[PDB]
Ligand binder design. Structure first.
Ligand SMILES: *[C@@H]1O[C@H](CO)[C@@H](O)[C@H](O)[C@H]1NC(C)=O
Lengths: 48, 50
């Protein structure tokens, strides 16, 4: 089971992480049953 | 999940992920019923010394 816990926080700090407490609610309990050892995030380009 | 108790209305603001509830002593105190999604409080049936 691949568990995704998520939280959205309104912040106004410019550069680093804010200092505070915010509990992450469980979002998706996912039934995959596969081996995971490496990951990579996906970004979006801007074309002009 | 099996048990015995009286099912009553509750005022506990359950979060959407949350299904059942546990009291201070960790006894289950409320459950969310399937099909209707309502939250029912579970209070143990009366017992005492005769
Ligand atoms: C059946 O259960 C689902 C969730 O378990 C609920 O969304 C749905 O409303 C229920 N349907 C009926 C007819 O009770």
């Amino acid at each position: 089971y691949f568990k995704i816990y998520s939280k959205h926080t309104p912040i106004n700090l410019v550069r680093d992480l804010p200092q505070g407490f915010s509990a992450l609610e469980p979002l998706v309990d996912l039934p995959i049953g596969i081996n995971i050892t490496r990951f990579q995030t996906l970004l979006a380009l801007h074309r002009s | 999940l099996t048990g015995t108790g009286v099912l009553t209305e509750s005022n506990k603001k359950f979060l959407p992920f949350q299904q059942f509830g546990r009291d201070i002593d960790d006894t289950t105190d409320a459950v969310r019923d399937p099909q209707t999604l309502e939250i029912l409080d579970i209070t143990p049936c009366s017992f005492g010394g005769v």
